[PDB]
Each structure stands twice: as structure tokens, then as C-alpha cells.
């Protein structure tokens, strides 16, 4: 990663804990660090057949060459919360017609996968057409 200190030692962490500690914590402990929406989702959420993504991610983390990035796993699951299991991983997130790849930085923790893959193009205007103003009227 580009930056020192973060989640490793001293004053930059998540909520006061290090990445190696977030990797020891259970879902029952971890839901005290997350905010109210993520806490409700983990408390209520049986996650029935949503564990399949976590299996494919941990397969790709296991089988990658030593000191090189995993291959992409590509998915429709835009409403998945980023767990501390998912850091340093490649995901392709569906956009309504294409998959956009994401390298999951540890600062992304507690966000949704769908927050990093955007459904539209930023607008830039062409000149106004006929009917755009009351004076614009056409007579043959």
C-alpha cells in the first residue's frame, strides 16, 4: 500500500484496533466497531448462500503466486459489506452492463462493494435545441 502507519501502529487505526486484531475478532465482536446500519445487517443477516463469494475470495488469496496479486472474482453482489477478510483482494463488480475491477484497500472497510462501481457517465452539455425557450418557435 502507498502509505505508512495506518492500522499497523500508533494513531491511525479503525476505531482504535490494528489489522491483525480485526483478523482475530469474531463477527460478534466486530459488530461493536461497525456503525448502526452495518451492525443491523450483521445482526439480522443469516447471509443464506452469500458465503459463496467469501469462499471464492479465500481460494484466490490462497492460490496466488508468492508476492503477486490474485486473479479477479466477478460478481453481481453490490450490497455486500466489506469485511476485514476481504482486504488486499481483486473484485469485479457489475455495473448494469460491465464489470469494473476494484483493488480492496483497507480504508474501504465497512463500505458496500457497489460504492466503487458507478452506474452512469458524468454529464457534459451540447448546445440547446428547438423548443428549449419560449422565443425558439419555428414557422415554415
Amino acid at each position: 500500500v502507498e502509505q505508512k502507519k495506518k492500522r499497523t501502529f500508533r494513531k491511525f487505526t479503525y476505531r482504535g484496533v490494528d489489522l491483525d486484531q480485526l483478523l482475530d475478532m469474531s463477527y460478534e465482536q466486530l459488530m461493536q466497531l461497525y456503525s448502526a446500519r452495518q451492525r443491523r445487517r450483521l445482526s439480522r443477516g443469516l447471509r443464506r448462500k452469500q458465503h459463496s463469494l467469501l469462499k471464492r475470495l479465500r481460494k484466490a488469496k490462497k492460490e496466488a503466486p508468492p508476492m503477486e496479486k490474485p486473479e479477479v472474482v466477478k460478481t453481481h453482489l453490490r450490497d455486500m459489506i466489506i469485511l476485514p477478510e476481504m482486504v488486499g483482494s481483486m473484485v469485479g463488480v457489475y455495473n448494469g452492463k460491465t464489470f469494473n475491477q476494484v483493488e480492496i484497500k483497507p480504508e474501504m472497510i465497512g463500505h458496500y462493494l457497489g460504492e466503487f462501481s458507478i452506474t452512469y457517465k458524468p454529464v457534459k452539455h451540447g448546445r440547446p435545441g428547438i423548443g428549449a425557450t419560449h422565443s425558439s418557435r419555428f414557422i415554415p
Partner: protein, 145 residues
């Protein structure tokens, strides 16, 4: 009267010593009507006097209470920074510290390029609002060719 000093400087900001004490200290950023009343109530100050009628040790009692709310038993549910994301603390942030705390929050969203960080960067409405008919700040454009 005593012809005492009627402008005073408190936290790198100037207070008019001429308003009621509970409405003079809200010239500090991070101190609203609701928080200013509770600080003076813990500080044991009479709310009826003008801000130029406080003695030198009374202003130091108010300043030392504003900077350490949790040791004078001001509740956690009152504070403007709750579980701060990088170190987990609870506090009230004031003056030029509030400017930097927002400056760090907008750059933290931009660095990972989340949707919030892109809307703040392009200068668009960040919360759920529509943009077809409100917030207009350009110039009228003519149809002619």
C-alpha cells in the same frame, strides 16, 4: 459598570463583551445555543450578566470546561465527534480544529474514490437531491445559431 473591558479574545476568536454571556460564547465554532447553556451550568455562572462582567478566573473556568467535557460529567450523547474513525475517541472539536477535521474527512473519501468523494470533487449535490431545477448558479444560454 466599572468601565471594564467590553471586547475580549478567547480561543483565537474575538467575543463582544456586550451580549448576555450564554449568547456571547457562541461566536466560537463548535459551540451552539444548546451546548453554551450546559457549559455555563456546569461552570456555576449566573446567566443574567453581560459577557464583559466576568472576572479573569471565571473565563479560565469556562475555557477549561469547554476543552474537557467528559471530566465535568457532560454526557457522551451531547458531543460533536463520536467514535472518531482513526482512534475511537469521544470529544467536542472547536475553532480551527473543526476546519481541519472536515478537511481530513473529505480527503479520506476522495483517496479511495467512493461516490461521496467524487460528488464533493465535481461540486454536485452530495445527499439525495434532484438537480434538474434547483441550485442553478451559471448564466442563461440562447438557442440561436
Amino acid at each position: 459598570p466599572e468601565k471594564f473591558q467590553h471586547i475580549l479574545r478567547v480561543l483565537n476568536t474575538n467575543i463582544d463583551g456586550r451580549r448576555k454571556i450564554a449568547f456571547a460564547i457562541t461566536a466560537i465554532k463548535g459551540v451552539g445555543r444548546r451546548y453554551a447553556h450546559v457549559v455555563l451550568r456546569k461552570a456555576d455562572i449566573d446567566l443574567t450578566k453581560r459577557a464583559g462582567e466576568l472576572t479573569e478566573d471565571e473565563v479560565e473556568r469556562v475555557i477549561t470546561i469547554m476543552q474537557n467535557p467528559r471530566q465535568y460529567k457532560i454526557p457522551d450523547w451531547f458531543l460533536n465527534r463520536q467514535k472518531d474513525v482513526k482512534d475511537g475517541k469521544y470529544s467536542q472539536v472547536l475553532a480551527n480544529g473543526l476546519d481541519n477535521k472536515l478537511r481530513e474527512d473529505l480527503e479520506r473519501l476522495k483517496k479511495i474514490r467512493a461516490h461521496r468523494g467524487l460528488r464533493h470533487f465535481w461540486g454536485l449535490r452530495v445527499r439525495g437531491q434532484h438537480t434538474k431545477t434547483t441550485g442553478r448558479r451559471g448564466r442563461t444560454v440562447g438557442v440561436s445559431k
